[PDB]
């Protein structure tokens, strides 16, 4: 005794679309990270809930250590090194999905993390206290 | 006070909520069969607090406790005049007058958060 009245986007519907266009549905995933509840069985229920808590806190900590916490997408001051890819700025944004780019760069992750941490610490916070005094 | 503004009008208890806010900024501070229950209790507390902090953090309202946003209020949800609301109604009555349209309001805040604030910010960054 029901009808269907679809309005908004699907969960991971934009995954087959292009990156610069599929960047506008980022809300729905973080909307749907910590729900589903909305003897042995309750044991594995609590197991699953703990795992979800752990991954969400891990990624929020990685957000918080960077200077891109709380908000969504942002900027930085680390200039790009062309040793990783060498595209000419249209082939990525208009001609490439996300799984393709993920398989292209899945060896350089930790260096990028460390260098963002480096520029976030250095010349941003000691520099702040330099600016906090004449 | 701990839930001290109960039997008041919404417009009446509209100024001293900051003392409520500092007093509601606690709960973990100032610290077998039963231990299973204790574990489950801690799990419930953690899940509720993280639910609230997630729903704050998605919107632009995750700093201060009151804020403004860019959504025009549609007259399909309620139709009562402004002074009629702020001087003649409690919180619970307003709750039962709005507790069917809540998810749509959430989704509209979400789309207003994503659109025209970050990709627009990204175009504003390019000089």
């Amino acid at each position: 005794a029901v009808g269907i009245g679809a309005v908004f986007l699907g969960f991971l519907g934009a995954a087959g679309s292009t990156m610069g266009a599929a960047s506008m549905t980022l809300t729905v995933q973080a909307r749907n990270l910590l729900s589903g509840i909305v003897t042995v069985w309750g044991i594995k229920q609590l197991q699953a809930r703990v795992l979800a808590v752990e991954r969400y806190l891990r990624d929020q900590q990685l957000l918080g250590i960077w200077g891109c916490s709380g908000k969504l997408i942002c900027t930085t001051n680390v200039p790009w090194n062309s040793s990783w890819s060498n595209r000419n700025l249209s082939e990525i944004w208009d001609n490439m999905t996300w799984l393709q780019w993920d398989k292209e760069i899945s060896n350089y992750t930790q260096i990028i993390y460390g260098l963002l941490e480096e520029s976030q610490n250095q010349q941003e916070k000691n520099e702040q206290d330099l600016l906090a005094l004449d | 006070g701990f839930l001290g503004a109960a039997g008041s009008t919404m417009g009446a208890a509209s100024m001293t909520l900051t003392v409520q806010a500092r007093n509601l900024l606690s709960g973990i501070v100032q610290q077998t069969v039963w231990g299973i229950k204790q574990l489950q209790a801690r799990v419930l507390a953690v899940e509720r607090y993280l639910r609230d902090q997630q729903l704050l953090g998605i919107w632009g309202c995750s700093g201060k406790l009151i804020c403004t946003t860019n959504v025009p209020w549609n007259s399909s949800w309620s139709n009562r005049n402004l002074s009629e609301i702020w001087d003649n109604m409690t919180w619970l009555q307003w709750d039962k007058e709005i507790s069917n349209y809540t998810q749509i309001i959430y989704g509209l805040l979400e789309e207003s958060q994503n659109q025209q604030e970050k990709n627009e910010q990204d175009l504003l960054a390019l000089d």
Partner: antibody
Framework: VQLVESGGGVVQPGKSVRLSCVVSDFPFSKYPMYWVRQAPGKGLEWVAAISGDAWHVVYSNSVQGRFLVSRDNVKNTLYLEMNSLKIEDTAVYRC????????????????????????????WGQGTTVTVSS | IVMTQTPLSLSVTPGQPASISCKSSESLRQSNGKTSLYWYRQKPGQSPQLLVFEVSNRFSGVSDRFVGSGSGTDFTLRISRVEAEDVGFYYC?????????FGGGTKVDLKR
């Protein structure tokens, strides 16, 4: 409560009409309405049903490609149309009301999809009959 | 989704209990937490009138002889104190899924 079923008549095949149904004594913007069908000397049959806010509509297995129904919330008046008729479509046509008051739609946070809810009826009016003849 | 009446029809006499079934073809346990089986009766040359909703819940302004019964396997009815006013056709009706379906027909009269 007041609820009439106007619109008797007799036609040959291949026509187009307009039907009316006057209501009173309820807040018309809240309720759903149905259309049932009773063949002569027979039992009952469901045809069509319009949504509460007049945006969703379902038909029977027969006339998907024939009919059209619409709601006037201002005049509190139902409008039905039956086109491309057949002589064996002669029955009793009645305009009756769901018992249970429905409410607002529901929006899931999982790929939106606004859902509606229906249930059966309580009140039948008198009725009418158009015999499609030759 | 189909639905059958059980049995067809019966002539009855006063001073007797009554029970009229309506066999399902599925189980219609709603996510709201109940089952969508309604009864409503008509009289000849007249309009139908609502008998019982909520499986087992008498309609407002109805004498106490009318209640409901049954679960998602199959259903029955429950009428005591047979009276001549209780004649006509009794229909069971599905209100779970589109399209709806109806009970066939129960002819009810006295005995000669």
């Amino acid at each position: 409560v007041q609820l009439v079923e106007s619109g008797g008549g007799v036609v040959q095949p291949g026509k187009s009409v307009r039907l009316s149904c006057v209501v009173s004594d309820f807040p018309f913007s809240k309720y759903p309405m149905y259309w049932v069908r009773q063949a002569p000397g027979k039992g009952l049959e469901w045809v069509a049903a319009i949504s509460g806010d007049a945006w969703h509509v379902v038909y029977s297995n027969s006339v998907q490609g024939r009919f059209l129904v619409s709601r006037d919330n201002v005049k509190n008046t139902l409008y039905l149309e039956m086109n491309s008729l057949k002589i064996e479509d002669t029955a009793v046509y009645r305009c009756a009301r769901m018992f249970q008051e429905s409410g607002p739609p529901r929006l899931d946070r999982w790929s939106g999809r606004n859902y509606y809810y229906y249930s059966g009826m309580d009140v039948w009016g008198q009725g009418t009959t158009v015999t499609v003849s030759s | 989704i189909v639905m059958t009446q059980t049995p067809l029809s019966l002539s009855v006499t006063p001073g007797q209990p009554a029970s009229i079934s309506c066999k399902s073809s599925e189980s219609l346990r709603q996510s709201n937490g109940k089952t969508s089986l309604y009864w409503y009766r008509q009289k000849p040359g007249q309009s139908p009138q609502l008998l019982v909703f909520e499986v087992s819940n008498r309609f407002s302004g109805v004498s106490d002889r009318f209640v409901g019964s049954g679960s998602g396997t199959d259903f029955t009815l429950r009428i005591s104190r047979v009276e001549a006013e209780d004649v006509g056709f009794y229909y069971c009706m599905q209100s779970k899924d589109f399209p709806l379906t109806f009970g066939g027909g129960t002819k009810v009269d006295l005995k000669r």
